[PDB]
Design a protein around this nucleic acid. Structure first.
Ligand SMILES: [Zn+2]
Ligand SMILES: [Zn+2]
Ligand SMILES: [Zn+2]
Ligand SMILES: [Zn+2]
Ligand SMILES: [Zn+2]
Lengths: 74, 102, 42, 101, 93, 108, 98, 83, 93, 107, 85, 95
DNA sequence: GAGAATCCCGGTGCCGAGGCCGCTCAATTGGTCGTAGACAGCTCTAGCACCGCTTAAACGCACGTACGCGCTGTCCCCCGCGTTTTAACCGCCAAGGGGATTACTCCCTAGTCTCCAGGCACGTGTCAGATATATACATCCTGTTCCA
DNA sequence: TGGAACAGGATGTATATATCTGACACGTGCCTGGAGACTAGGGAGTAATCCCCTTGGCGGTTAAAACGCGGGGGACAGCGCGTACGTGCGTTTAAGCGGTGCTAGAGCTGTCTACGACCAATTGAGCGGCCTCGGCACCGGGATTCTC
């Protein structure tokens, strides 16, 4: 199960994620492979911003899904 | 090398006279739009009533005709050297004018 | 009318919002959508 | 400004013209520095005068000097833009004509 | 004497787009100047085209080419579409 | 013979007849066609609608109800193609877009 | 010691305020007197509509603001934060006015 | 009427500083004021000469906002809002 | 078909100024383009002025004012002088 | 009567009649006055003579009996007023003026 | 009948860029100037050629002419002498 | 061998004294055709049109390099670098 | 944490934005007539594709050096603040200059016809000039020499 | 030991002659565009009148400009290093030249037809004037935010 994350710089990065994984793990590997601090990341999918305590299966995110990343400096 | 020349002064007097006053060039200033030379007093008195050259009637300036007139030491020395005696007559006149009114 | 979708980040904006709540991109005309080559991440 | 008439100038009478039948004699060095062209250092011919500084030059001399470069007056360093800043001087041409034929 | 302007048509368009918004006199004057300037630009381009091609008449083709030459990108594309639609409607009715 | 305006004929708000008269009287060509005023009016109306929509959005974003030259300037200078079209135009009472070089701004 | 702001903070505050504001920044009567004196050379006994001097002032301030933006860019390019006549001259020469 | 001499001193240092602040300038040297005065004088000379030429061709004695607009348009400084 | 150009008159003026100097074809083409550009600029300015003053005729006054608006300084002065001299010579006949 | 050209009448070398025809057919105004073409022809002749004289001067200076675009470019760019008039004009085969910044010179 | 043309900007060689810089009066050139110049030239050519092709297509022709190029350059403010007009 | 700079100065003088073109004609023609392919297919070109395009391009690049050199000297350097081009174009108003 | 700037809220006033009515002149509708151009046909030219040859120019590599890029230190010159002063601004009045409109008439330019010579396409002889060859002068650099 | 001065070899470059050559300048036929005469109708010059708006002056009221002070931050200069660029050489690539052939398409000519200018009658759209009530400038008071 892979996902695609698109940045505001036109960069699409492929991640190997499990549907049961929570977004905490998602941004964990985001920092691991990109160095983006957790507080600067906002996730957009299906016209809604993901809630902190929710996991992918709640949002019914399927294979080859594209999620948009927004960076806001803190 | 040119030689020493003696010439009639009536030959160049018409080309050395001042039209407005009829006398020799004293403090000669020239209008630069047409390059026409006159006595400073003559041209400054005329310029307060007209904005055109007395000779060729060309517009000297649109607003301030005094802005295009320049005093010419060249023709000054030309007259002082070509004609004899004006320098003595003139400085005697200034001294005898200043000898009574300080 | 109904909620309008953002062109830049696709997050659904309310009909009363004229700049995006996340990316603060001015809403475009009904015919011309706003472009992306305007600013950067920072 | 810088043109107000002085107490002498406002009422001075014209200098009477000398109409007597006398000749004038000039040496070839009487008018030397007054008639020397600053460029060629020779007797002036086809004289041209600048509008702003009223400095006389030989026509060919000033044309060549301006073409070469340094668009300022060779005598007073004041800038002149082109040939249009100069006027011919038939007065001086006639003067040198009778003076040294 | 009368002084013609585009104020009524600008107000009609404004009411069509934003039903609840007004416009001040200075803004209306800016709009009038903008319309006049654009009109002048397009007409000059069309006249130059017609003179270049040895033509004595200005047509919708010349106007379309002038619009393409002047307006950038998407503006030119949509303006051409609107002009073609208006011409087709006028010719049909 | 009921009179029907050409603007209503072509479904436009702009004065097709006035545009035709101005084209005729402007010394652009010896003669003008029939569709040229319609095309020009449609283009002018489209541009006006674009400008007015952007200005209205900008104005009511500020929570006012009147278009002002500041709103017009903001719309024009914030739309890229409109700014390219009006690069050499100065709008009275418009001001400038707020922008400060980051070098001048302190940071950490 | 009383309150003492470090240099620059008031500068950025003024920058923000004047970038938010839209009014004219030059005095009306001095600008009008300058305009009339400049116009004295071409014609004499001229008269001016008020809208004429208003348009002149608008154009003048717009031109000056654009020139100062270009000067600031030149100054930042030269690794400085202070604008200088060299920056002004370079901006004008590149623009093509000199 | 008065000779009206020495008027370009009325564009004051605070006004020049305000214009610079609107332009986004943080620090200003001491000679920028003289430089700005010279530049403004040149700009005004050009625009006024063009406008007065238009007015004189119109055979009037009053300079109009439309004449100023025409001069600016000829110079490439198109201005909106004054007709 | 014949194509008109100012080559003959350019050659006449060149022989008037420099009797023993010739001109190449590329230089002549450049001179022709220069003359066309100046003619177009002056004519456009005169037409704009005539439209501004609500006139239907282009006259020597419009030409003179356009020349003053376009040519800088001494060039404009000498051009005005030559134009007035030519006009008075033509009308005094 | 014998036909006398308007150019000869006004003492000009330029085609007054052709200028009048171009003014009439150029869509500039509804009517064209009689004295308008003479003025324009005289102005064009003066400008041509100015440039041609400068071009000839540069040509004979280089010892080239023939004017070339290089001579035209030198003449135009060496004069401030002509350069300002032709500021946005490119001359083919004209080259550039010889000019190097003093700071670039060897110390 | 042609299929596709590629890497024709490369034909603008580094020695040619150095020659242009020398005519401009440049004494010392960095390494990225070549790429920057290639991009700038590509943009300028794109604009001019687009305008010229628009003129040609309006003329209902299939050959781009020097008159079309001159008209495009004049429209862009780059008046060019020597090729007609 | 010469120190650096002498050959550069000689090249500057040589290329400022002459008026010939500095770009290879066939590569320039190929580039022009490739660029034109994106607008209309199967076009034809006149040799004069290609020559005019080349002249305009070279003049534009020469002017841009002059402005770049001015910027580089202003920044107290003798080497031209891409930010000088960027600043020159931004001030000219092309970007 | 003290202090100055600026957003947020609520009142108040006032003036101009928008709606309404009357008139008048300009856009509609209808018809005619002259010619601009849309289409078909033909010609010939110049744009494209190909060949081979020669050598000019681009490419790649190596080396030394000089110049761009921190880094530090100093000192001087804008910035921020308080106090004095000065003239900008606003409200008011008054006079007349000239911009804007109207009416009459006159003369100047468009349009038509006829005539004819000025300039353009075409053809051809000759010399200005690019190119080649050789030479002496101005630049440039490194190695050597004398003084500190 | 280095640093300023100088001599000699190498290289670019202007100068002096000879080649030959393709473009420049001149002569000719003719045909189309410019000149001479004449008419007529409207654009524009000229004179008179109205009243709108510009100029000039006055008196308060402050808002803003001018002047002086202390000090800290930024501009400038000197230093060191190591990295990127200029210079030179040898090799490889392909551009420029001269020639051939084919044909698509630009350019010119005849026709005939549909389209736009021009004129009349008219009637409704838009401009001028008026009037009113709500949106925004300014007022004051808290509350929040940014600096030092
Ligand atoms: Zn005179
Ligand atoms: Zn006298
Ligand atoms: Zn968004
Ligand atoms: Zn002098
Ligand atoms: Zn001399």
């Amino acid at each position: 199960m892979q996902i695609f994350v698109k940045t505001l710089t036109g960069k699409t990065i492929t991640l190997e994620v499990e549907p049961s994984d929570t977004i905490e793990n998602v941004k964990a590997k985001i920092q691991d492979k990109e160095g983006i601090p957790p507080d600067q990341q906002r996730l957009i999918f299906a016209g809604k911003q993901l809630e902190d305590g929710r996991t992918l299966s709640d949002y019914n995110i399927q294979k080859e899904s594209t999620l948009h990343l927004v960076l806001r400096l803190r | 090398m040119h030689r020493t020349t003696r010439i009639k002064i009536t030959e160049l007097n018409p080309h050395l006279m001042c039209v407005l006053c009829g006398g020799y060039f004293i403090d000669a200033t020239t209008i630069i739009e047409c390059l026409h030379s006159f006595c400073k007093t003559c041209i400054v008195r005329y310029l307060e009533t007209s904005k055109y050259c007395p000779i060729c009637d060309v517009q000297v300036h649109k607003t301030r005709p005094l802005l295009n007139i320049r005093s010419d030491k060249t023709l000054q020395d030309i007259v002082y050297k070509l004609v004899p005696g004006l320098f003595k007559n003139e400085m005697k006149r200034r001294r005898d004018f200043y000898a009574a009114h300080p | 009318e109904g909620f309008w979708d953002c062109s830049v980040c696709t997050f659904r904006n309310s009909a009363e919002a004229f700049k995006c709540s996340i990316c603060d991109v001015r809403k475009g005309t009904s015919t011309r959508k706003p472009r992306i080559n305007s600013q950067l991440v920072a | 400004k810088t043109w107000e008439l002085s107490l002498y100038e406002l009422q001075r009478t014209p200098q009477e013209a000398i109409t007597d039948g006398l000749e004038i004699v000039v040496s070839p060095r009487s008018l030397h520095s007054e008639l020397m062209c600053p460029i060629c250092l020779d007797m002036l011919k086809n004289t041209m005068t600048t509008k702003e500084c009223l400095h006389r030059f030989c026509a060919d001399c000033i044309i060549t000097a301006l073409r070469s470069g340094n668009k300022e007056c060779p005598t007073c360093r004041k800038k002149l833009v082109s040939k249009r800043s100069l006027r011919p001087d038939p007065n001086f041409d006639a003067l040198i004509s009778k003076i040294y034929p | 004497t009368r002084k013609e302007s585009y104020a009524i048509y600008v107000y009609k368009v404004l009411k069509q787009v934003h039903p609840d918004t007004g416009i001040s006199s200075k803004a209306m004057s800016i709009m009038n100047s903008f319309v006049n300037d654009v009109f002048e630009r397009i007409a000059g381009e069309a006249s130059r085209l017609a003179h270049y091609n040895k033509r004595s008449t200005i047509t919708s083709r010349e106007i379309q080419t002038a619009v393409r030459l002047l307006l950038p990108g998407e503006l030119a594309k949509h303006a051409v579409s609107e002009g073609t639609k208006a011409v087709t409607k006028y010719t049909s009715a | 013979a009921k009179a029907k305006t050409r603007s209503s004929r072509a479904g436009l708000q702009f004065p097709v007849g006035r545009v035709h008269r101005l084209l005729r009287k402007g010394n652009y060509a010896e003669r003008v066609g029939a569709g040229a005023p319609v095309y020009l009016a449609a283009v002018l109306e489209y541009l006006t609608a674009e400008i007015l929509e952007l200005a209205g959005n900008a104005a009511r974003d500020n929570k006012k109800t009147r278009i002002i030259p500041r709103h017009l300037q903001l719309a024009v200078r914030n739309d890229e193609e409109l700014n390219k079209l009006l690069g050499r135009v100065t709008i009275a009472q418009g001001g400038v877009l707020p922008n400060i070089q980051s070098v001048l701004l302190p940071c950490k | 010691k009383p309150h003492r702001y470090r240099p620059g903070t008031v500068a950025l505050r003024e920058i923000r305020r004047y970038q938010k504001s839209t009014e004219l920044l030059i005095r009306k009567l001095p600008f009008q007197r300058l305009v009339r004196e400049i116009a004295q050379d071409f014609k004499t006994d001229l008269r001016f509509q008020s809208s004429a001097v208003m348009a002149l002032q608008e154009a003048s301030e717009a031109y000056l603001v654009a020139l100062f933006e270009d000067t600031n860019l030149c100054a930042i390019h030269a690794k400085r934060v202070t604008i200088m006549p060299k920056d002004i001259q370079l901006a004008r020469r590149i623009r093509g006015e000199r | 009427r008065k000779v009206l001499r020495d008027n370009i001193q009325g564009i004051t240092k605070p006004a020049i500083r305000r214009l610079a602040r609107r332009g986004g300038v943080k620090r200003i040297s001491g000679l920028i004021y003289e430089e700005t005065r010279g530049v403004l004088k040149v700009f005004l000379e050009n625009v006024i000469r063009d406008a007065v030429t238009y007015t004189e061709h119109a055979k009037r004695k009053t300079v109009t906002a439309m004449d100023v607009v025409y001069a600016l348009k000829r110079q490439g400084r198109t201005l909106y809002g004054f007709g």
